[PDB]
Design a protein around this ligand. Sequence first.
Ligand code: NA
Ligand code: NA
Ligand code: NA
Ligand code: NA
Ligand code: NA
Ligand code: NA
Ligand code: NA
Ligand code: NA
Lengths: 329, 329
Amino acid sequence: SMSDTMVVNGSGGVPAFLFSGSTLSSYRPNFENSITIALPHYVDLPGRSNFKLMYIMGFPIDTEMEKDSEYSNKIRQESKISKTEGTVSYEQKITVETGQEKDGVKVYRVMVLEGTIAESIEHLDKKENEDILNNNRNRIVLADNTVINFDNISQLKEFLRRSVNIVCFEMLRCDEGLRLKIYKDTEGYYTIGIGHLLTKSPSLNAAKSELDKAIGRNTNGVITKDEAEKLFNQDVDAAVRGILRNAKLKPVYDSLDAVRRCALINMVFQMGETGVAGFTNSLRMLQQKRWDEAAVNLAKSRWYNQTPNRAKRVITTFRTGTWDAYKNC
Amino acid sequence: SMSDTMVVNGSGGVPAFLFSGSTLSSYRPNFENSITIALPHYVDLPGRSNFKLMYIMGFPIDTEMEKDSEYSNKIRQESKISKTEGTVSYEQKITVETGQEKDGVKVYRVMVLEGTIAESIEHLDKKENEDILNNNRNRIVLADNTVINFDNISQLKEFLRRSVNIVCFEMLRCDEGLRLKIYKDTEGYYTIGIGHLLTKSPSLNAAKSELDKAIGRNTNGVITKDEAEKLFNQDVDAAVRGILRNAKLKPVYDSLDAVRRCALINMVFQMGETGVAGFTNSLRMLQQKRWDEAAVNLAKSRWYNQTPNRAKRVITTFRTGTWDAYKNC
Ligand code: NA
Ligand code: NA
Ligand code: NA
Ligand code: NA
Ligand code: NA
Ligand code: NA
Ligand code: NA
Ligand code: NA
């Protein structure tokens, strides 16, 4: 007929932009002739059940079908973990995929294959990955082969950041408290959650307006426990973003392990970025991993003199890289 | 190891730009679920032996392997047709492919699937196809499943144009002669081949310089029969290019069949583009397919009066759309 399609190019699809962008993967299959990389090659991911991958042009495609097949996976179970408020334990590897599904067939491009949460965060922020992530369904395939389906890409990125930032949550809760209703801090300012300053305005309505903006709903000044975690995530993200823009803080931050990063973030929560940036000598000792020397030097500061109990806890965290000071808080 | 590749994107390959550009194909397979178009689907091309295609994202891939396989073709035989000077009969459909081969494995993207030569010419000139054609090996798979391998894309395009233009060759040979050595035309000007004017200069050296430039070698004023065909192809191509830029000639040309196009090209060879563009009424009659009226009107012209024998032959070609006037020339 006249409407028959005679010319095909790369437009559309089904899923969209399927072979665009990049994939991060420590695993790299070894098949064999170089000129046949664009031909499909199938492999079972080492160490995993029901995890067959089809490679095309070096990219992995994860297909699931209800129909039994030697070339696709069985339909995977959905995880019970909340896509809105849940986390994945921060040390587990994850697989991040983007694609489409319908009528018992699922076709997903693998974007991160058994990567860390932090690797996943950086990878999904790459500009070359915007088109594929923004135009397809995004999911995580967990280490146990269950799946978390996300409503949109931002929800997935927020879940990832929540999973890494939660590592600092109980530490800051210990030091700053956790409140689910607006209260006044020791300076008279409206605050909620884990030391989250809403406004310096004496207007309670203004504080509620700020809270509603941060949470994204009409809270009437009351939040859930998970929303305290949401504000905390926003605050940690802001702190880290500022640290990385500050030539006095980036090198030390880049050098620290997760637990010690929490201690640096704790200092920023307490005294602000500029204040922490003033600790030139102690920061240098931390960057050089001179833990005992750093701890000794931090204790000689006005910070330590003003709040010695919290400072002792933070300093022990820098000295040891453990949660010893926060056990049973 | 530290050099291990952890990030893969679309760069390189193996063959290069394999899923770029567009494919022209009257045939369109019917598989089945929309979201699985990026998964490989295999089909045997209807009406052909040893012609299995692998479809990915709507594009066909033609693979050949020495190793026996249910998923690739047997190695195809090379055609005896000359890649430099040969042709394919102008009514045969052809398959144009671009790709790579080595060590008994061949992987080719199908660019035109059983298309006409004219369709192939237009398709391979599309800007979106430049990258894939310029960076891979180009071949034609003929209707008999034998293959013509081209040294580069220009050689393939020239072969295609030669195959369509040869249709006019014996007609113009009949009317203008064929000479393999430089001679002087009736106006004293150096000429060769099928009425190919080299220069109006009285310098034989200048004529040889022009000839060497057109042919692309040191000819010393002597060409082969196939080189007369090369000059003819260049002249037909130039004539057609001019016709399509001329608002007075394009509509009639667009409307004519192959044989009648040769008659219009014959007129341009004889009297130049501007001269042919003067035949407003006769061109209009041709465009409207009023063959008898056009033939009657063309015979009333000064052209007919000056060269009635050639004009009678050209006019019969416009009247009938046959080679009747050129049989046994
Ligand atoms: Na790893
Ligand atoms: Na690593
Ligand atoms: Na990894
Ligand atoms: Na210091
Ligand atoms: Na056709
Ligand atoms: Na057609
Ligand atoms: Na066709
Ligand atoms: Na006329």
